[model samples]
Target chain A: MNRPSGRAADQLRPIRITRHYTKHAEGSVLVEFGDTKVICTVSAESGVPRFLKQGWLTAEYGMLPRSTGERNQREASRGKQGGRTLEIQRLIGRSLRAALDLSKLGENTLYIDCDVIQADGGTRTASITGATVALIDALAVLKKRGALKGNPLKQMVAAVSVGIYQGVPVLDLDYLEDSAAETDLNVVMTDAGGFIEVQGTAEGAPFRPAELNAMLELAQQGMQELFELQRAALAE
Target chain B: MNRPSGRAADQLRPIRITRHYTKHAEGSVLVEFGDTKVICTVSAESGVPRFLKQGWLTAEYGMLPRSTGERNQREASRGKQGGRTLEIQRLIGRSLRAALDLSKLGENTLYIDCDVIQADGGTRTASITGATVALIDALAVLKKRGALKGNPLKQMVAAVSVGIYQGVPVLDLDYLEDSAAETDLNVVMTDAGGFIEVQGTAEGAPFRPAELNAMLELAQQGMQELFELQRAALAE
Candidate 1:
């Protein structure tokens, strides 16, 4: 179960993080997974959600025309969010919320808007990983406003996908690898090495418990490297 | 002041109201001002706007692709409303709202979504005129609930557009006539007669008070016929 393309189980395909993807938002970054590109921007607003009551955070996700094989719906034109946009954005908000403690932060809302400039596969996972960094930069703007005592972000979080293909486990599945995998798992973790969300689906056959543990081990390594990338980006 | 194609200055473009144009939506009517065709659909929802504690009213407006000379935007594709859509839908909303008094009307929202199937000119004016009928029919749906407490609508509301083209005031200007006009005005009122709103703009030269008065006078004749048409449509 160690080989997908006759390679080691834990090898990820060169992740790239490019910041300042666009001029608008408080912070914008383009994260690439193989050929897929997602532009994650964080726009901080003055007011908070009704539930939060000026508590700092919310997010929205959209896909640009020509992002996929067929052009998906544009949220800007629909006058309301599409089901798919709602789904991805809800996931991003939950993942980011898991990394932050909102009570410590003051009255301000950070609208994290994740727009996919391009997409192949693993777009959502890349978005989760990239937007975490963008969120940190957005908080810096609020920090300067005297709204935050300190960074409310307890630790960095990153996500990677592991899948079983041809009775083998592989790390960071690309579109092709993911499409053919018998079992697929998208895993996210905190910097302290604890599970945030474990979403696994059986495409063809259910994976054994040993395979799942091996896949988790591979994901831990890939995600740790992702956390390092986040630290490096924030340092800049 | 008298001759437009040798007809009287106070004549309309021969009104026509066609219903059930599209399969979707609760009420779909194609209201025409000569060649200008606007498919107005009234989708009746079950609830009221968030602002109102209880009410049986709501409305929206839309234009179709290829409705104009060039391709306009598709509102369904853009997730949020643009300024132009917001402006048109606001007019539709206002006109329909005036038809119903929310005090007696229970908790129900009639979604009057006016989609412009075609646009020769005066699309907004036509949408308002037709959507009122759609709203009337939707209100009839409330009859079983014993919600109609003596006709919330005081008097029928209808709209018409007039413009000054080559120093002559033309009533119900088509796209060819309206686009080339110096000044344009859209007027809405009740059948028993009261101004809902009067929006007049100078596309070129500034309009004189006399010109506005003349347009209003021409608009009155159009509204009179519009009231008769509404009666004919609802009459069994």
Candidate 2:
């Protein structure tokens, strides 16, 4: 009859971003969306791979074995990662890659590791949102060291998940709602009003054009708050 | 000069096998060769993959970030494993698969995890030599549960490494000797007088046929002592 969390259809979950969560990495952040928690770290290495003539940015994603209700087998012990893991890391990499101009960063590599310590839902979107801040912090180190040829940061990036649950459009689904969602859409965008990635899937029925537009609008509204939070975190 | 550790040319490092090293896995062993140490565990899952009509066995290999003199990057955080990790695990899997008759074990799967906690040299060879004992322990569990159709174990398997150090053929090479060796070879075999794998490399000069034969003989001699140690450990 109503939303599971008793919120408006367009309401987002409570979000928090903590910077410098870990000391070893150049930049580290612990981002939480309701019950989901992810630690994002950005490590800077001196040189890039031979195939990459300029600087490069890549990402890896993983969940702790006990992050969910049940313990999951570790991918490290499984020999290879699953397809879903690969897809989310690729999406995170692509979204973050759009934030920087590689040519100006010199021959270097930025490795973003988004490790989910707890899981409810929206882990991938949380990873992209948090990893963006980690990336900026890493860039500050490069600038302080006088490594950058010029300003390589192009724009700030964030992501959010919008879905149709119980025949109603909802913003920022949790695990309870996500599992029962009829349609799910993950959107990544920049503050400059440009879409970085849009991934949608229909669970019950194929969504129509109107539903698609509704989801996009909700995602845009949610991302606005995320970008503001990013700025506030950097200001600290 | 004599060998790095002042052992004879055909001598092996001190070897020890400790069983039930971990409580969680169906079978677990800590195998040590000189300064090298590895944890070998075999976990039995209830069912096999859809593609497999019978039982199956697979293996995975990994080293701790600080296992070596200099800390190596964790492959889980590196997004993908390097080529050497893949090659070693494949060899371990193939060598162990030769020890069991999968079709006789019902629809179960054995997952072998060989994790290097400390490494000097010959980590892969140590993994195979240890993992075979862990596999036998796991099979004993199946036997106790009356889940096995019959004795799936066909024979006992073991592995060892031999190399040419300063033109002198040696039975075992520690890190100091391994790095300075001109040629290196790793051999995997079973008690039934069968070779499972033979991998060789010439770092300084091409090895002659005579050199290969000498290395094989050294490997065979070392494996006999390993098999005896494994049996003694299992008996206790």
Candidate 3:
């Protein structure tokens, strides 16, 4: 095992969650995992996505130009989105929707905009974790406005990434560790301990079933603490 | 009559310019007019703006979410540019091309990205002024590479906003002043004293010839200072 830090295999880097990071957003929160920083804002509107008759939610994820070591490309000038950007945004939308009770939300659409202010790695996981909190706060605004009869969130959802590095499953891999890892996976689950989605990729070697189960176990363990943080942030 | 900051009807705001705001870009500078803050970056590419193959230079403009009094919408997530955003970007691109000697640029394209990091008003004007310096730095890179035989930029280009607020012409209208102005005008001109493009709109009453002349005169004076500021930023 490549435990260079001499810590446990399933240790996460430090995390900080801040609510109301920016104004103008209905619910704005800044979520950080180690050096990865994401600003998740939930904007509520009356209309839903086109496919559904009732209200729904959508998500758009983007990164600032200098979010990485080098300045990234500008999607605005590039016209259509590339495949990777499209895939991740769709994942953000689907994962966050697990929190909402669609029928009870009425005809409103929640725009979850997860903007990566910085990237050390695990950016998508931080987006989902922080965005859930922001979405909850914005929905509470709906209750106060008398739009929602009751809380429609069926279950609180949060996500984190766990990977097998040098035969050891690790939690919340930073860029340094993630970039060189053999296998990478992002796991999203609800507080009720059910999986919303699980995305895994073998960057180098194919993972066996035993290795997959080990990764999932580490993810579930990390997710338990993450939900606690989400709850405490929404407490005040 | 609402002289909130107590400047004269035709008085200009003090200007400030900072060069090399960020490390990665070929040229990065922040231009300020009053409280408006604009970051202008010049990136050189190997081709043209996809029109006429004459090797034209173009620019893109955007504002950060917290750049203004209220957080404006993010253009990237909005999927496409808004009407106002499109119109203003077109103006910036056109004005920049007017200052360049296209034939001498020798098939190289310059990408000027102007992002308004803060907005008290006059964002477009500040962008134009700073963009000039950024363009110079990009050209400098091309020259140092021995890629060009002659100077691509024929002369300097700058812009300024003039508004008719409370029946009197103002040199640089802040956000509060701009919102209530009867007529708004933006003038793009070269350092050698020639008009490139003039965009004027009547919010309430259409302007007469005399009013147009007066606004252009104010624009000339304001643009002169802006030209000097661009020079100072590049001198660094």
Candidate 4:
């Protein structure tokens, strides 16, 4: 009758974002949502992809072979990536691009790499929330070096996952709840209270309009907390 | 001009193949051609791909991030493989498949992974030579377990690289010689003197018919030596 983690319906799991997690990338962060851990890095290269004049943002995502309960085959060894991996990275790229003004970027490309080192659930949402902070850090470096024409970031962005578990809408589903979820919704939003992207899927049965509204509301509440956490980490 | 390694024009690099290199894979081998080292493993899965009644054989190739003199980006982190990686693996698959009679295999799939841990040059050829031996070991396991319909291997297969160095045909090209070679050729052959693949490129000047014949002769000489090395390793 209650949630797996025994929290309130709209309460998010414990979140932590550690900045400068790695040395090589321009900006690196380790984002954790409960047991799920992802390392997000923003690497700024000199030029954008061919045919593009202004700056561009693209993302690549991967999971360690032993990140999950069962060891998954390494994609590099498999010779190709799976569709789920492609879709999640695309979503992350699109969400981050929405928060930026690419025209102000000066002939550069931002490559966001989200590598999941541990998996409980909500890896994609965690990556997006953390990568946005890394993007901010990278932009600051570019600006310090006088490489940017103007500020490229329009607003701060974050994402959260909300799902219906055992008939009640819940915020931040863990692997235990996620695997048994009826409906899952991932929402990316700006700090100005605007939606960037909303993705929802029903695994058990079709979700109703009311359920969708309830999930979005939970996601909104979660996003506000995430944005606050991101600012707190950046301030450090 | 003398060759980089100071070996005779008809000589191959020092070759070594260590069998059962790893415990998890059904068949594993560590093959070294001079300073280049590749780990080849054949993993046998119970089912073949859909629409296939008999067994299938596939190959994948990768290099460790620090496998060369300079570090190369991990392809899994890059989200997609480069064209050279794809081309090399396809050649490996074709070369090995030509050595096997897949119809005799039960509904199984052999996944060959060729990972270069250290590379000087000729990584693809080393992969093909090593993976063929790994495939033979895997088929022996299936036979011992009474899982195969009959012997699936038709003959021994091997590969080698030959190139025109300083206007002279050479049997094998290391990194130093390969980088300056006028023409490069990779040949895959069976022990019965059948050509499975022949890939040639003119880095400087296009080779004449006689040069091509000279290069092929060098490749044939090198491949016979590789086949003998494979046999010696399997005999152990």
Among these predicted structures, which one has the highest TM-score? 3
True contacts kept of each: 0.28, 0.06, 0.10, 0.15
> What is the DockQ ranking, best to worst?
3, 1, 4, 2
Instruction: Give the poorly placed runs of model 2, Cα more than 4 Å off.
Output: A51-53, B1-72, B76-236
Q: Per-residue CA lDDT of candidate 3, range B134-178, in tens?
A: 778878888888776589888999888899887888888888788
Task: Provide TM-scores for the models.
Answer: 0.51, 0.55, 0.72, 0.55
- Candidate 4 lDDT at A142 equals 90
- Rank ordering of all candidates by TM-score, starting from the highest: 3, 4, 2, 1
Model 3 residue B34 distance off true place after TM-score fit, in angstroms: 7.9
* DockQ, each predicted model: 0.11, 0.06, 0.17, 0.09
lDDT of 3 by residue, A149-188 (tens): 4678989999999877777888988877787787988999
Q: Interface RMSD for every prediction, one decimal?
A: 13.5, 7.0, 3.8, 6.9
Query: Per-residue lDDT tens digits of candidate 2, residues B14-93?
Result: 99999886545678888998778887888887888874656889888877543565446767755577898999989999
Q: Residues A40-91, candidate 1: write the lDDT tens digits.
A: 7776656566754426666666554434544344444456777767777788
**TM-score of candidate 3 relative to the true fold:** 0.72
lDDT of all predictions, in order shown?
0.72, 0.85, 0.80, 0.84
Residue pairs with backbone atoms closer than 3 Å in model 4 (clashes): none
Q: Global CA lDDT of candidate 4, please?
A: 0.84
- After TM-score superposition, what is the CA distance of residue A155 in candidate 1 from its true location, in Å? 0.9
How would you encode candidate 4's per-residue C-alpha lDDT over A1-236 as one tens digit per residue?
Answer: 59877888888889999988654567878899888888788878787788455799988887754356554687875667889998998999999999999999889988887877668889999999999998999999999988898999999999988887778888888888888986899899999999999989986689989879888887887788999999999998
